[PDB]
Design a protein around this nucleic acid. Sequence first.
DNA 1: CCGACAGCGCATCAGC
DNA 2: GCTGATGCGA
DNA 3: GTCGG
Length: 327
Amino acid sequence: APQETLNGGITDMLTELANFEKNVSQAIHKYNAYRKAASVIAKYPHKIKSGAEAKKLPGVGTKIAEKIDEFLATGKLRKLEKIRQDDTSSSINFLTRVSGIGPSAARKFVDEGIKTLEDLRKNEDKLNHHQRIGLKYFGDFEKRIPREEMLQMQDIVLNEVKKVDSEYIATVCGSFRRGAESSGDMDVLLTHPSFTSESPKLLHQVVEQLQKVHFITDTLSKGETKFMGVCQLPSKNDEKEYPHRRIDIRLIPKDQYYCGVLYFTGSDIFNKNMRAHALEKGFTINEYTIRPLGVTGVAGEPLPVDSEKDIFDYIQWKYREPKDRSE
DNA sequence: CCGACAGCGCATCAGC
DNA sequence: GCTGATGCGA
DNA sequence: GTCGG
Ligand code: NA
Ligand code: NA
Ligand code: NA
Ligand code: NA
């Protein structure tokens, strides 16, 4: 990976613009265009000398090449400088860091004078359940989770799930499964032999047990197949308590389980390249199933999958260790 | 020139 | 009461 | 904003 020093000024500039498109202008596609440009530039192993040079990279077009030229010659971007100083826009952009507060809620809050966390604290009744929790753990939620804590967190989840019913199968995915040194949250996929695509408390019993042992502390949303909440490792003797963490738990039918583990294990880059290689071989792979694309294009029924490898086999690909799925 | 850029669970809104 | 749409997330 | 039919 190229050192941040190479084009960090440029990548930082593109990422800030991305946030403003997403959070203020509500232009999600522009948001992603910037992110895509920032990503391709972030992996470019050379210090960019001009916009034209950058334009050769996929995802970098005329407008961004133009912005790069301005930043190389001035060390900044007038539009970015201006929006940063804009009280309304910087406040809308900032409020979106609260989990539960999106571009719409952020805009509404700022419209009525609520611009800071302090304002949010004085207006609890104007926040829904999710937002109050995002506010309560604002700092904790932005902190990363060291792998050691992730292992401790896994120990608890795996233990409690098996305690509820030894037949449950639980897999912690995300970058953690790929061996990451830290994580932004914990993503748990859960299944049970009694639950197939064609077979109401399976998920509830697990969440309940996790709350019973005081691991899960709050709930953002909870249905029959998906749970999104907060957890916290138990504090040690006289030791500073651990920060609260975001944890999601999805209940997936057995026959769609491994397609789910693969997908949620990523990385996204790997998922694309795998979805690509998948198509050229006559297959389509999403998070639910792998299906054979017919002669005219009639995707027959989903193929049977009993493991990640099963999927790799259908596309003539040597099973890839989560460790080697960065792309 | 102009459409795609992912699809979907849950919470909550808009409206009958 | 309900259905469908919208906001939000990851 | 960028790509591509
Ligand atoms: Na380009
Ligand atoms: Na947010
Ligand atoms: Na956010
Ligand atoms: Na048992």
